[PDB]
Amino acid sequence: SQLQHNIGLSIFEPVAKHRANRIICTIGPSTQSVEALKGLMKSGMSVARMNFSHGSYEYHQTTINNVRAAAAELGLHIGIALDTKGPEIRTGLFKDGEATYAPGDTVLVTTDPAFEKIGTKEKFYVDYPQLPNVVRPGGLIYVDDGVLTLRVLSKEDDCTLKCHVNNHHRLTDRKGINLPGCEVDLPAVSEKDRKDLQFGVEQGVDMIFASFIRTADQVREVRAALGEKGKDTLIISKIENHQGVQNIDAIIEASDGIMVARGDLGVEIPAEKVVVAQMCIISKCNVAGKPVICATQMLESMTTNPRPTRAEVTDVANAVFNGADCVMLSGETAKGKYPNEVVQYMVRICIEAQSATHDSVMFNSIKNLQKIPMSPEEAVCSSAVSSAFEVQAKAILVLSNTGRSARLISKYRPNCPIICATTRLLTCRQLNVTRSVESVYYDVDAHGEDNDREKRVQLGVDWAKTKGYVSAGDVMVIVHADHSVKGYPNQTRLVRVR
Amino acid sequence: SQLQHNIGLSIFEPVAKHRANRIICTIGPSTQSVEALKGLMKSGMSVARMNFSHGSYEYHQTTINNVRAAAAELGLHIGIALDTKGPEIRTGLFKDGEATYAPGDTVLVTTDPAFEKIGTKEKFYVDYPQLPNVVRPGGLIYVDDGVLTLRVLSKEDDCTLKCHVNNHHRLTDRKGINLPGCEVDLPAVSEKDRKDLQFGVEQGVDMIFASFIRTADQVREVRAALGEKGKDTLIISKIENHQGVQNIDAIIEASDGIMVARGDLGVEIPAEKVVVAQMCIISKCNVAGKPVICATQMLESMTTNPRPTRAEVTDVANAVFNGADCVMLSGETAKGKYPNEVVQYMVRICIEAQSATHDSVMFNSIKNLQKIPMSPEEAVCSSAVSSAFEVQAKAILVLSNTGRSARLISKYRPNCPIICATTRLLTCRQLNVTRSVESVYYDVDAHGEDNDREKRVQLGVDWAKTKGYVSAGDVMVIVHADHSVKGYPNQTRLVRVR
Amino acid sequence: SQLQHNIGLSIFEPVAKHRANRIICTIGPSTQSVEALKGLMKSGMSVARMNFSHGSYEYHQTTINNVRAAAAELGLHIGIALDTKGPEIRTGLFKDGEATYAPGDTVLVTTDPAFEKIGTKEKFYVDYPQLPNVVRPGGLIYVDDGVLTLRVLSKEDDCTLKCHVNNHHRLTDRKGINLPGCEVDLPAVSEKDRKDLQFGVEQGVDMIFASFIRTADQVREVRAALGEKGKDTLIISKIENHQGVQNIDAIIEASDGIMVARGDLGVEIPAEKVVVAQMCIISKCNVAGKPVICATQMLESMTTNPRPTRAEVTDVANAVFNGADCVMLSGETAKGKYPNEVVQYMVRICIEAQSATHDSVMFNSIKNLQKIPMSPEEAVCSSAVSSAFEVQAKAILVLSNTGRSARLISKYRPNCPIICATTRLLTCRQLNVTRSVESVYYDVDAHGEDNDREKRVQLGVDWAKTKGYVSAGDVMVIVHADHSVKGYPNQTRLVRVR
Amino acid sequence: SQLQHNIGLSIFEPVAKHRANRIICTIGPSTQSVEALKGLMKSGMSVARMNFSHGSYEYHQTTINNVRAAAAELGLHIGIALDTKGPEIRTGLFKDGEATYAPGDTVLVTTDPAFEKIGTKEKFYVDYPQLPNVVRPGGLIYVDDGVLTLRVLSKEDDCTLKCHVNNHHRLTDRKGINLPGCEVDLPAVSEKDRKDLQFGVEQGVDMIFASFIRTADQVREVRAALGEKGKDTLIISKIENHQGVQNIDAIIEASDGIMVARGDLGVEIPAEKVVVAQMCIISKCNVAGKPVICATQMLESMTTNPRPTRAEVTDVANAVFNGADCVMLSGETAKGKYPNEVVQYMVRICIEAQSATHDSVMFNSIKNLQKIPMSPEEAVCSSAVSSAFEVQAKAILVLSNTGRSARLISKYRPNCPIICATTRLLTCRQLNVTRSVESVYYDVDAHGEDNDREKRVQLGVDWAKTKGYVSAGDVMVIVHADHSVKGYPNQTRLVRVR
Ligand SMILES: O=P(O)(O)OC[C@H]1O[C@](O)(COP(=O)(O)O)[C@@H](O)[C@@H]1O
Ligand SMILES: O=P(O)(O)OC[C@H]1O[C@](O)(COP(=O)(O)O)[C@@H](O)[C@@H]1O
Ligand SMILES: [Mg+2]
Ligand SMILES: [Mg+2]
Ligand SMILES: [Mg+2]
Ligand SMILES: [Mg+2]
């Protein structure tokens, strides 16, 4: 019982030794430096995010090279993320530089490019040609991140739409426009996005944060855009609207993970419904066994302030309580005054919330929602986590090359950390988005074939000992395959470290 | 299962008709006007709050009169709350204006009043005399809402303490000093507090928000300070330090309700632990069946901004999810630019979170934690709520003169609203702090004795019909007593409304 | 948990004060005497059963008059049961008095009445004309309570059937025949049964044990046979085969109660499957809220022996554990050597099993299987039982005239006894088949109208006090209707006896 | 929920392929023949029982040799059980043949051996010397299996006791005397018992059924009497009195298994309380993970009758439902007319009850009552059973030389059978008392060392395939250890059979 658990939570009891949840930082001017990055990584940064909505290929090249330099300096594996610009619906150019609007005025939204360069305070151009046809009277239009609200009145021309202004705001040249409720037939990947993805794939980005995902087909378009060179790179779809949350089931199946992009989602859907969307998306991603990132204003006030609001602390804590693997900073680390301090605060809230969680409940809730019969790979992974709770194991060790086994072990949310012994360095950086998983690399070319699992196994137990989780005599759960049939785990064994 | 509930949450389903949670607003310059108050009350305000940390008695009666005028104009019962200044530890005067401090400096904190008017950037005065004795080396001292951190190095004088400056901050004249992790032997009620409470009991304040409650004995001191004239006024203890959370069990038993004053609590205790304190305090207050309020900066950004942060929305939602009877606005409504808009947003998050809650689980969690045998009054009230879930009752009606029965029904957190038919107007406003309850007054002198509880019963069913909760043919649970017993409810009846 | 409950069952702890389960005795030569009946009633007999398979209308008249005399002598209400002879399939007359059969022989079963009086060890007559058509080769035929098994080989004539004998047995004149698996199209009520039911209805029998019920339509035929004079008499359908257990759902809806007639059922269906049928039928009758009688060989060895077998004791105990309201003796009391002793043993096993039962589980199991929204009558009855567990009530009092309310209170299986205050004497004798219900009669013509519930209420509390369940100061749950709308209960009140 | 399970039980659904429960038969005149034994073994006998209360050593080796011959002929492993005579309290000789007693008479029970050979209907001798001292007035004495009841009135001599005859019975020479509700200080092992156990350990009996176990110290006395030659033989303690049930916890810890000897227990303790003792003892033995047998008259009527009573069928079914590893026949197979038929009926009730059981509930009930942290051996075994339910495994394979691992897997009551590949033939027969287990022997001297557990693994999968449980493509859970550890299982693997 949550009520029975809460009555008895000690504010004076010691927190957990290890940190299970992961932190994702947006690299910007405040954090592009190799010294600033070595600072974020030391504070808690597991994944470096690049927002491609702005910035040149020379800028992001510097971000790629600087994160890799800082990571190699500290001897850590950090994931490189590419947040695509995505399909945009922007306004035209405004007459003499700007145009202001007052509550009551009758404005005209035209799709004829004649009003593109010449946009007055009475009529202006919009990128979307479907616009007058898709948007029907009574319906709403949001301009400049929902700052100015427009109500559709009547269709003037086959290109124009008569609108009522009900929010006093001044619009600048080619400002963004969002259409609530309506199904937008924009491309999955824009012309820039395809060139951005090409640069990303060629430069070795670990994962892609696919901006504005509405359908599962749109996810497949992104994987196709990645090609044979980007076959193994993760696709984390960003849910930014109604079509995201409506087709969440299909988008989960198609994607490698999901991001609750509360930023654009809060502009599309009503503010109060973003909590319900968060909870729904996060729990569906847990039953699925795919990573979940929470994303906007986690600790917003710390962009200028040295301490977060009471609200910002509960938001970081409850994202972890919900079941999120990751928590995200963007602007708090990109353009913020306290870049190291904000990550340090996030880490403390994560370890606190992690300690205030009933560890057995999350496993039993996920397990009981599982379809029986389970695949032998899944029944071995869930039972490995079951054994961990039973023997009170200080750590779980998994020999996963893809990361697919480590993700299915993390799916059953254990109390202890998961150590992943892998032969691929990409896997080391891709498990930075999955909870409780701490990767170790085994160089096959520099040590041996190790067909009989024993070097990777001895490597992992040694790492867990050094990191301070397991001491001599402690019991560890070990997951791999039997010397007979490999490619999926079937083996589970309980061993004392010593 | 919370996981199974979450995976089945619709962002497109309709919200609940009634609002169960209650909203408290701090009255300030932005909201002192009778028109501004009629605006808060229309937006969602159930209780008006008066922060006695500042403001004259002439100014506080201006708000008392204006709230009473706006309430009578709209025909509503709004509770009047007195948030006491409480025992304060302030510094001395900074000679030549202000003193500035740099990380590394050796400062002196003296209890000798010789440094009271003459406080330099090397030595200054502190209100607390028992300061060098209670605070031992290694310990921390927080100046100006914890902004400046100082660590005790050595005892210089029997009045002075040699300290190390931990951060860069500029201190003003008579700024606040908080002492983390140590028992402060300050009075429960200060000299100003006693005069404030006297004015409070005189002007007919419905409830007292007792600032900085450390022990249960301290709440009895406040009740004694209220006297025979303030016997019936509610005492809501504000948990502001580590002692409040340590003796929470005893403070609950002694108080009429509790407030999680996250503001001063976040300054005393580490930021991340305020979530654990919140959850613990809120759930303990539910098992006890006593109101619990959430407070510090919930929708903070809306003081300047017309929309809240993603964090602020989840904070309001999760306070309701935790089990909070109330949610509070301090400064957002006091000095805020959008006073009506912030309350309107809070009400929308409350109704959303209220809909995303598992109706039966909260009742069964609270019921199973109660000691058996139950008192006949409690077994009637819990079974009335059990009947409400069983018959799918659209509303519960209770005849409660004190409000103790309505609080005992709200304790079992029903899905429907609770209509309280009372003979006391104080009860109408005192139940603005309890969840689901919506009071109706029965003027005994203007209608009749109603010894056979029937005029009140017909009054209540009429109110529920008009407010739109119950339609013709709907079933209602009715709680009162028979003729052979009084003072406590005995009877429960399921009636089809005509 | 059953395992957790069992570990902790004390063989030395004191048993319950009251007996919740009921005992039904078959009246025969050993128990027809007014002194023998006063002996059964004193030992535990709540219902007197008359097996109409044998015995004249003069014999059963004596049984009716003698039970009524014994009941009036002891001042108790005992139910009079009529177990109908039912549709029979009997053999013809055997040549020179008998015919024997050996494993391997080829026998002939003819439907031509030419073989009725002349039945040799090679060919004999059977009552059922559908017989050769319905019974197909490979199928089984059971003669003389399944003692001799016959396998169908081929259809010789349109009246005859060639059979293989596979059990050495000697058949007598017009011995019984049972057809396993097959659907028998016999009448619901035979020519004798209709005259028997006429005698029963006219003599005032409280209930009818309808022999060999296969369909719900067959139940309606029995109620039609009872007419306007037998409108209020209970129909307890006897499940004696495959068609009984297959259409159990429909037979439950149509009947007033059910009897697991294990006797004929064990001859029809395989012996091991009678446990599964028992458990299924008993639990379905609990969710339905209709009485369940368990019936054959409860304590068989005690027909000749003064002590039962270890098996017979677990059978009586587990019938009570399953959820049976009643347990039945037939032959153990009818022709038995120890008629008083067998009932005395049954009562001791019932009180023991009643004490070893988790009282809360049976209520919560039944309640959670209930369809929500519940009728106001049901939500008040379940919540009255919920209140009883909560306040630890020593007894529940119900004002039921039909018995329908007392049966729905007993449906939620409370820990305490249920006292039924009724205005009908038939109701007093019909609640002898429902668990925990102990009836009290209120003579309307001899005391008053009592439109305001208070005489019946004071009558009940007095009865519970005298019987020793409630002492002064004890809390009682009282169920009736509000002075406004009667005919169904809506009122529930918790009162202290004193 | 058991109620929800029951309401969904099909009397027409197919039963389980394997039989999980085990059957024990008492060898007597009806079943001593090698052909009669080959008949019992073919019908269901897993363990052969020898009642040493009667019969010479010459006669008991005749059964030892015949069971071993019949087992070797059919190629099966059957356990040889020695049910000791135990400490007996018998009367003296009745002068002139027999003595008769009538209700009301004043009899004398003397401990002076002067009345040993000369015992009249007024005074007789009793074996127990401490009888007048231990038995105090008001107390009961049971003569000839409790048939004759006598109440102590007063102490006549320091050897005699004046008693009141409670019922009419005729006593024979040297009939048994049981003393209810008092601690009998008789030896654990009698002079005959020690010589019987010596013969037992000499002829290689697999298990000892220790008659009349009072304390845990008494079971250690029996283990001491077995010596170094009988170190590995199982000690199944027979609970026969009120002390056995009082010290059940300690008797469980000390013993290798338990028998609910309902026969003598039903004579000591009241008949109705034997159900509560059964349930308690059986469930405590499940949490402990030790075998538990049910015994006295389960299918009693079948000693003379060809079909059992309705009661006898529910008794066999409910013993399996309770959690009994074994069910026993004493006299039904020893002196019975239908020895093969009774075992055949028992097997059918076992498979029926086994099918009507909730597979997962028993596992989860046992698992949740176990102390955490679990030993690595136990967490492997429980998780192996957890995996079996998850993957829907058709069989579990265990390599257990002692049998301790197979008993630990059977402890978690899986849905499928357990195949035990052992290197000891004693283990093959000792596991005939544990549920689900079906042993396979691996002759180390005739095949190889098999240090890498693979020949045994291939042996087991082959056995499961042949017996028809696992088909091609089916998944099996395999439990053993790795090379780095031995003596206890460490590994668990899920393999698809080829
Ligand atoms: O304690 P509370 O909530 O005021 O109400 C308890 C009592 O008040 C009552 O209304 C008694 O006063 P009435 O005269 O109005 O019945 C009863 O319903 C009940 O016994
Ligand atoms: O204690 P048990 O049941 O005999 O078996 C435990 C041990 O037996 C073993 O079979 C060891 O002997 P092996 O040499 O056959 O592996 C292991 O599986 C296990 O460690
Ligand atoms: Mg976007
Ligand atoms: Mg303060
Ligand atoms: Mg019949
Ligand atoms: Mg004995």
Fill in the amino acid letter for A217.
Answer: D
Contact across the interface for D276 and C348, Cβ inside 8 Å: no
Q: Which CATH class is domain B360-497?
A: alpha beta
SS3 C161: strand
Cβ-based burial of C113 (10 A; exposed 0-12, middle 13-18, buried ≥19): exposed
State the CB neighbour count (10 A cutoff) for residue C152. 18
Residue C256, both tokens: 């007033």
CB D327 within 8 A of CB D292: no
Sequence-separated (6 or more) residues with CB below 8 Å from residue C412: C363, C366, C367, C381, C382, C385, C386
What is the distance between the terminal CA atoms of chain C, rounded to a whole angstrom? 37
Rounded-to-integer distance, Cα A69 and Cα D275, Å: 75
* DSSP code for C232: S
DSSP of D61-74, one letter per residue? HHHHHHHHHHHHHH
Cα B70 to chain centroid, rounded: 22
Residue A133, both tokens: 């046809």
β-pair partners for B91:
B126
Pairing mode of beta strands B45-51, B22-26? parallel
DSSP of A239-269, one letter per residue? E-SHHHHHTHHHHHHHSSEEEE-HHHHHHHS
Question: Phi and psi at residue C262, in whole multiples of 5°?
Answer: -55, -20
Question: Phi and psi at residue C24, in whole multiples of 5°?
Answer: -115, 120
Number of alpha carbons in the 13 Å side-chain half-sphere of residue B213 = 33
Name the experiment that determined this structure: X-ray
Residues 270-289 (A) with a CB less than 8 A from some CB of B: 270-280, 282-284, 286-287
Cα separation values, B426 from B77, B230, B433, Å? 9, 12, 12
Residue D55 gets the label, from left (phi > 0), alpha (psi -120 to 50) or beta, of left
CB B274 within 8 A of CB A352: no
* Strands lying side by side in the sheet with D395-399: A437-441, A418-422, A395-398, A475-480, A491-496, D491-496, D475-480, D395-399, D418-422, D437-441
Sequence-separated (6 or more) residues with CB below 8 Å from residue C228: none
Any atom of ligand 1 within 6 Å of the Cβ of B407:
no
Q: Angle D339-355/D34-43 helices, nearest 10 degrees?
A: 20
SS3 D384: helix
Reported as type and span, the H/E element at residue D304 is none
Closest CA to A320 of A19, A1, A14, A6: A19
Any atom of ligand 1 within 6 Å of the Cβ of B400:
yes
Rounded-to-integer distance, Cα C483 and Cα D326, Å: 61
Q: How far is D8 from chain C (nearest CA, A)?
A: 7
- The CA angle D422-D75-D346, to the nearest 5 degrees, is 95
What is the distance between the terminal CA atoms of chain B, rounded to a whole angstrom? 38
Rounded-to-integer distance, Cα C353 and Cα C321, Å: 6
Cα separation values, A155 from A115, A122, A133, Å? 17, 15, 9
Compute, in angstroms, the gap from residue D480 CA to the centroid of ligand 5. Answer: 57
A491 → closest Cβ in D374, D383, D493? D493
- Look-up of token digits 């019908």: D43
Closest CA to D152 of D174, D119, D180: D180
Rounded-to-integer distance, Cα D120 and Cα C146, Å: 51
SS3 C353: helix
Rounded-to-integer distance, Cα C304 and Cα B331, Å: 90
CB C391 within 8 A of CB C417: no
Cα separation values, A493 from A363, C169, D404, D478, Å? 20, 63, 19, 12
Rounded-to-integer distance, Cα C370 and Cα B394, Å: 19
Residue B392 gets the label, from left (phi > 0), alpha (psi -120 to 50) or beta, of left
Contact across the interface for A493 and D490, Cβ inside 8 Å: yes
SS3 A306: coil
Rounded-to-integer distance, Cα D223 and Cα D333, Å: 29
Cα separation values, C329 from A410, A424, B282, C26, Å? 61, 77, 58, 6
Query: How would CATH label the architecture of C360-496?
Result: 3-Layer(aba) Sandwich (3.40)
Extended strands (E) in C105-211: 106-110, 123-125, 140-143, 148-154, 160-165, 169-171, 177-178, 207-210
Rounded-to-integer distance, Cα C320 and Cα A247, Å: 52
CB C258 within 8 A of CB C293: yes
Contact across the interface for A349 and B272, Cβ inside 8 Å: yes
- C56 at D interface, C-beta within 8 A: no
Sequence-separated (6 or more) residues with CB below 8 Å from residue D424: D401, D402
Residue C138 gets the label, from left (phi > 0), alpha (psi -120 to 50) or beta, of left
State the CB neighbour count (10 A cutoff) for residue C207. 26
- The CA angle A459-A462-A467, to the nearest 5 degrees, is 125
Rounded-to-integer distance, Cα D42 and Cα D70, Å: 10
CB C482 within 8 A of CB B493: yes
User: What is the b/e burial string over C26-61, where b = at least 16 CB atoms within 10 angstroms of the residue's CB?
Assistant: bbbebbbbbebbbbbbebbbbbbbbbbeebeeeebe
Fill in the amino acid letter for D362.
Answer: M
Q: How far is B322 from chain C (nearest CA, A)?
A: 26
Question: Which protein residue's CA is at the shortest distance from atom 10 of ligand 1?
Answer: B399
Residue C440, both tokens: 């009290």
Rounded-to-integer distance, Cα D210 and Cα A307, Å: 74
DSSP of C402-449, one letter per residue? SSHHHHHHHTT--SS-EEEEES-HHHHHHTTSSTTEEEEE--HHHH--
Q: How far is A15 from chain B (nearest CA, A)?
A: 10
Closest CA to B31 of B85, B78, B75, B84: B78
β-pair partners for D22:
D326
Rounded-to-integer distance, Cα C246 and Cα C251, Å: 9
A66 marked ligand binding residue:
no
Pairing mode of beta strands C418-422, C437-441? parallel
* DSSP code for C107: E
Cβ-based burial of A324 (10 A; exposed 0-12, middle 13-18, buried ≥19): buried
* DSSP code for D176: B
CB B28 within 8 A of CB B333: yes
| Count of CB pairs separated by less than 8 Å, C with D | 195
Question: Phi and psi at residue A359, in whole multiples of 5°?
Answer: -70, -35
Rounded-to-integer distance, Cα D236 and Cα D430, Å: 11
Residues 143-172 (B) with a CB less than 8 A from some CB of C: none
Q: Angle A57-74/A34-43 helices, nearest 10 degrees?
A: 50
SS3 C114: helix
- The CA angle D449-D453-D459, to the nearest 5 degrees, is 90
Residues within 5 Å of ion ligand 5, judged at the Cβ atom: C 86, 211, 264
- Look-up of token digits 């079948």: D302
CB D366 within 8 A of CB D286: yes
Sequence-separated (6 or more) residues with CB below 8 Å from residue B157: B110, B112, B132
State the CB neighbour count (10 A cutoff) for residue C148. 21
Which one of the ligands is nearest to A211 CA? 3
What is the distance between the terminal CA atoms of chain D, rounded to a whole angstrom? 38
Three-state SS for chain B is CHHHHHCCCCCCCCCCCCCCCEEEEECCHHHCCHHHHHHHHHHCEEEEEEECCCCCHHHHHHHHHHHHHHHHHHCCCCEEEEECCCCCCEECCECCCCEEECCCCEEEEECCHHHCCCECCCEEEECCCCHHHHCCCCCEEEECCCCEEEEEEECCCCCEEEEEECCCEEECCCCEEECCCCCCCCCCCCHHHHHHHHHHHHCCCCEEEECCCCCHHHHHHHHHHHCCCCCCCEEEEEECCHHHHHCHHHHHHHCCEEEECHHHHHHHCCCCHHHHHHHHHHHHHHHHCCCEEECCCCCHHHHCCCCCCHHHHHHHHHHHHHCCCEEEECCCCCCCCCHHHHHHHHHHHHHHHHHCCCHHHHHHHHHHCCCCCCCHHHHHHHHHHHHHHHCCCCEEEEECCCCHHHHHHHCCCCCCCEEEEECCHHHHHHCCCCCCEEEEECCHHHHCCCCCCCHHHHHHHHHHHHCCCCCCCCEEEEEECCCCCCCCCCEEEEEECC
* Strands lying side by side in the sheet with C140-143: C123-125, C106-110, C160-165, C148-154, C140-143, C177-178
Cα C484 to chain centroid, rounded: 38
Reported as type and span, the H/E element at residue D480 is strand D475-480
Fill in the amino acid letter for D128.
Answer: Y
Rounded-to-integer distance, Cα D385 and Cα C470, Å: 50
β-pair partners for D81:
D49, D207
Rounded-to-integer distance, Cα B411 and Cα A378, Å: 42
Active site residues of B: 49, 90, 238, 296
Cis peptide bond N-terminal to B103, omega within 30: no
Residue C86, both tokens: 């039912």
Reported as type and span, the H/E element at residue A284 is helix A273-288
What is the distance between the terminal CA atoms of chain A, rounded to a whole angstrom? 37
Cα B17 to chain centroid, rounded: 25
Rounded-to-integer distance, Cα C361 and Cα D360, Å: 19
Cα separation values, D447 from A366, D249, D420, D423, D451, Å? 46, 43, 18, 11, 12
DSSP of D37-91, one letter per residue? HHHHHHHTEEEEEEETTS--HHHHHHHHHHHHHHHHHHT---EEEEE------BB
Q: Which of B381, B401, B451 to mutate to test the pocket of ligand 1 (most atoms within 8 A of CB)?
A: B401
CB B438 within 8 A of CB B467: yes
The total number of residues written for chain D in this structure:
498
CB D226 within 8 A of CB D197: yes
Residue A100 gets the label, from left (phi > 0), alpha (psi -120 to 50) or beta, of beta
Cα separation values, A64 from A79, A82, A257, A424, Å? 10, 10, 22, 19
Q: Please note each residue after which chain A is broken, C-to-N distance over 2.5 A, or write none.
A: none
Residue B259, both tokens: 């407030």
Query: Do A and C touch, counting CB pairs below 8 Å (3 needed)?
Result: no
Cβ-based burial of D488 (10 A; exposed 0-12, middle 13-18, buried ≥19): middle
State the CB neighbour count (10 A cutoff) for residue D445. 7
Rounded-to-integer distance, Cα A188 and Cα C193, Å: 80
Cα separation values, A197 from A85, A204, B389, Å? 10, 10, 54
CB B469 within 8 A of CB B394: yes
* DSSP code for D395: E
Compute, in angstroms, the gap from residue B311 CA to the centroid of ligand 4. Answer: 25
Closest CA to D425 of D441, D404, D436: D441
CB B292 within 8 A of CB B326: yes
